Write a protein that binds this DNA or RNA. Structure first.
Ligand code: MG
Ligand code: MG
Ligand code: MG
Ligand code: MG
Ligand code: MG
Ligand code: MG
Ligand code: MG
Ligand code: MG
Ligand code: MG
Ligand code: MG
Ligand code: MG
Ligand code: MG
Ligand code: MG
Ligand code: MG
Ligand code: MG
Ligand code: MG
Ligand code: MG
Ligand code: MG
Ligand code: MG
Ligand code: MG
Ligand code: MG
Ligand code: MG
Ligand code: MG
Ligand code: MG
Ligand code: MG
Ligand code: MG
Ligand code: MG
Ligand code: MG
Ligand code: MG
Ligand code: MG
Ligand code: MG
Ligand code: MG
Ligand code: MG
Ligand code: MG
Ligand code: MG
Lengths: 118, 25, 66, 81, 181
RNA sequence: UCGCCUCCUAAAAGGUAACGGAGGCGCCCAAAGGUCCCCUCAGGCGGGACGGAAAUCCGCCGGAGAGCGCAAGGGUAGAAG
RNA sequence: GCCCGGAUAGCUCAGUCGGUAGAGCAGGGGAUUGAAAAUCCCCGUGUCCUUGGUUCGAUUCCGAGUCCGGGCACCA
RNA sequence: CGCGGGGUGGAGCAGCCCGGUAGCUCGUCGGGCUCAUAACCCGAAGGUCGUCGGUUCAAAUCCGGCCCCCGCAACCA
RNA sequence: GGCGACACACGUGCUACAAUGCCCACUACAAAGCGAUGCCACCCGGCAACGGGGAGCUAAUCGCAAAAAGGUGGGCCCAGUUCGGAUUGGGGUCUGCAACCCGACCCCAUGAAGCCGGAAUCGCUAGUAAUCGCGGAUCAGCCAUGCCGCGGUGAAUACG
């Protein structure tokens, strides 16, 4: 069944199937399992629709999540740019922010190669 | 893996300790 | 409505994070809905739970006391 | 980070706190990019240094903890071609 | 089936608040609510009307009524489109069946819309009807997510007897339409 | 260039020439035919997920500028669509 | 209009005493190569010109059928 | 003037018949092999089709004009 | 301030693409080196980095120290995943006058490319190659995956 936003996981496990939600996994996940007092080894396939509205309510309420979470990250950066700060100029030019080196492979942040002549 | 610091094996590689490699002998 | 190839649309039941919506009158009676906003969680019947704005707020407060 | 901390340079930290209660506000040239900014800095006009020259920067509330050399970038780029 | 809570809710407490607000000499002049028209434009289904037979199946489930099929008005090159083919399903519901559907849409559907900070309040058409549209079909109670092959949204038309939007905004507000203000 | 069709030349009936000005035909359709019943266009603005100048949907204005298998003309929604 | 002849995987297309489908350059996989090309080992419905019909059965029998060749023919 | 052909990546040719997806050789760019260059190998980028109209749903492709290019012709006088 | 630039291009590397594998728990076996301006046991606070407190050692006499693979047990069930951890958001610890440019680390969130790599091309003949952790030099801290060394487990194959 479906937790915050929509994000339906199923089968497999529950502690695992919690990760599949945006904002959640490992730590945040293994936590809400004990704090709603639910067995982590269960498979979300089967469990009482009770524990489900228990688990939904905790997770969905405790911390902000996939819709509102993502949009806040977006919102931090919007502010990191347009403030005019450096950390946000490396946002404007799509370039690596936290330290590192751009003479050679930035690729993850740089996109695929666009080769040129010599 | 040796690069995932959020594992036992990762920290050991990086030489560090923490929640995923606490120090108790 | 022409008679044939058509949903029945018989009085229903339905559920939520809330109790029933006993309006009902639908196809496929007795349906179970994830949760709503109206029933007043989530926006309508405004909770504003979990709420934001700390980021301009934060590096003010902690900052020169620390 | 620091915390037991909050490092600002006395040089201008003075000259800003001065321009607080004098009642007057001016354009202040600093070489200190190592220091932090605000709140008694906000609204002031500071010229930071990039290594080459002194660059005017307007201050405001969301500029909060950001070291003065953020808003004064060091190298020149303008693309490749 | 003639009872239908929202309909009830219109007569006792939507009309009265509407008279007392705009003020109306005549019993009729006050806005009635006619004809929500649901339309799925599907180019998605183009050469395949196999797709279509499930989509129309799906709308009937939510409306209690099957759509007719719109067909291609003219032939247009830049995206496929001989003038023959089916472009989409469209169903016109009124009178009860509109209400029983409108009800679920207000109480259930939009709640289950991801995020949803409220309906656009500029989509009144200026002569005081309101269109809105959805990006997926599984926000309805009648859809189980294991019956979805692929996600196609629709356009919802709502036609008010209200002559202005100012009036039409009120009617739907008081009816319970969540707005982004 | 040579037969056929439309428009001008053609002088408000018909007809009317030039190695005068311009374009089309040598098909097509078992529905694109008969009849009965319905239905009314292009376009403009406003609205609406993917929909963009344009796919579909809703509102208002729109008397014919759309359509009529193909050239032009005549004609035609009180239908020939 | 005739007579018949040419009818196959992707290509030449080869194979009609009825029962089953095949090779070469191709295409891919493997050795071999520093160059490529030989050579060598493996894998391809191609429902064999089309449809009713005849016996167990039909690339393979009969009526129409479809497409193409020189060779005939004819043309108010 | 006249009849026929053509104009498309940098170069040379296809494709235009038969409307819908632009191909080939060289060249160019990045990598390889070599001490190195060449040859050779593995990758790649690059045309809106002379032009303006028109026809169609759609035009390199069918039609009209103009602009070049090649070609043939221009006899009895 | 720059040596840290970034359309690109090459050498050396590291971490991987997973089930002879990943994770969590427990249970083991090394060597060589370092350190009383330093190593810091053990106690307490914190998820943790680490911070307090504080004992022993000029050190076969105390400390770094847990060796890791291995082992035992259970979990994952072939999935772009409990694979893989790049990137980014937020929150902190430490060094240092100072971490914007340019430190390392910890937590929370984010989770990318990647499903064994064209032409080409490198190392190794045995305690070697693979693979696994550990120490020092420099050093405030550290961009060390580097370098110089240490032991753990431990192949294949040479017709010619
Ligand atoms: Mg770095
Ligand atoms: Mg991992
Ligand atoms: Mg500090
Ligand atoms: Mg409006
Ligand atoms: Mg209206
Ligand atoms: Mg004739
Ligand atoms: Mg006329
Ligand atoms: Mg006349
Ligand atoms: Mg006359
Ligand atoms: Mg219109
Ligand atoms: Mg419009
Ligand atoms: Mg007309
Ligand atoms: Mg005509
Ligand atoms: Mg006419
Ligand atoms: Mg080259
Ligand atoms: Mg055109
Ligand atoms: Mg003569
Ligand atoms: Mg250097
Ligand atoms: Mg850099
Ligand atoms: Mg390296
Ligand atoms: Mg210790
Ligand atoms: Mg503790
Ligand atoms: Mg201490
Ligand atoms: Mg150590
Ligand atoms: Mg991928
Ligand atoms: Mg951060
Ligand atoms: Mg720094
Ligand atoms: Mg820096
Ligand atoms: Mg796999
Ligand atoms: Mg490799
Ligand atoms: Mg040797
Ligand atoms: Mg080491
Ligand atoms: Mg050091
Ligand atoms: Mg050290
Ligand atoms: Mg290190």
């Amino acid at each position: 069944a479906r937790i915050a936003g929509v994000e339906i996981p199923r089968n497999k496990r529950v502690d695992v199937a919690l990760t599949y939600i945006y904002g959640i996994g490992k730590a945040r996940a293994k936590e809400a399992l004990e704090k709603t007092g639910i067995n982590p080894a269960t498979r979300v396939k089967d469990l009482t629709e009770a524990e489900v509205v228990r688990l939904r309510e905790y997770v969905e309420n405790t911390w902000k999540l996939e819709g509102e979470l993502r949009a806040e990250v977006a919102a931090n950066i919007k502010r990191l740019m347009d403030i005019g700060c450096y950390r946000g100029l490396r946002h404007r030019r799509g370039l690596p922010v936290r330290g590192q080196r751009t003479r050679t492979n930035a690729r993850t942040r740089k996109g695929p190669r666009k080769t040129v002549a010599a | 893996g040796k690069g995932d610091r959020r594992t036992r094996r990762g920290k050991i590689w990086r030489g560090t300790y923490g929640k995923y490699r606490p120090r108790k002998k | 409505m022409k008679e044939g190839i058509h949903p029945k649309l018989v009085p229903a039941r339905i559920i939520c994070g809330c109790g029933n919506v006993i309006e009902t009158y639908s196809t496929k009676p007795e349906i179970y809905v994830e949760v709503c906003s109206k029933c007043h969680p989530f926006y309508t019947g405004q909770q504003r739970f979990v709420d934001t704005e700390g980021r301009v707020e934060r590096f003010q407060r902690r900052y020169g006391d620390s | 980070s620091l915390k037991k901390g909050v490092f600002v340079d006395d040089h201008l930290l003075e000259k800003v706190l001065e321009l607080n209660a004098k009642g007057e506000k001016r354009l202040i040239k600093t070489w200190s990019r190592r220091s932090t900014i605000v709140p008694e800095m906000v609204g002031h006009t500071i010229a930071v240094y990039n290594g080459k020259q002194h660059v005017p920067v307007y201050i405001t509330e969301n500029m909060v903890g950001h070291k003065l050399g953020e808003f004064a970038p060091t190298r020149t780029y303008r693309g490749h071609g | 089936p003639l009872d239908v809570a929202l309909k009830r809710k219109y007569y006792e407490e939507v009309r009265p608040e509407l008279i007392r607000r705009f003020g109306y000499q005549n019993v009729w002049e006050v806005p009635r609510l006619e004809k929500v028209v649901i339309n799925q434009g599907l180019g998605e289904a183009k050469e395949d009307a196999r797709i279509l037979e499930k989509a129309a199946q799906e709308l009937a489930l939510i409306t209690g009524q099957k759509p007719a099929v719109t067909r291609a008005k003219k032939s247009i090159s830049n995206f496929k489109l001989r003038k023959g083919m089916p472009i989409g399903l469209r169903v016109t519901l009124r009178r009860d069946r509109m209400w029983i559907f409108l009800e679920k849409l207000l109480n259930v559907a939009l709640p289950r819309i991801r995020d949803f900070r409220g309906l656009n309040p500029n989509s009144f058409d200026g002569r005081g009807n309101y269109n809105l549209g959805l990006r997926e079909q599984l926000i309805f109670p009648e859809i189980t997510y294991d019956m979805v092959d692929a996600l196609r949204g629709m356009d919802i038309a709502v036609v008010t007897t209200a002559e202005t939007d100012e009036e039409a905004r009120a009617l739907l507000e008081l009816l319970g339409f969540p707005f982004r203000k």
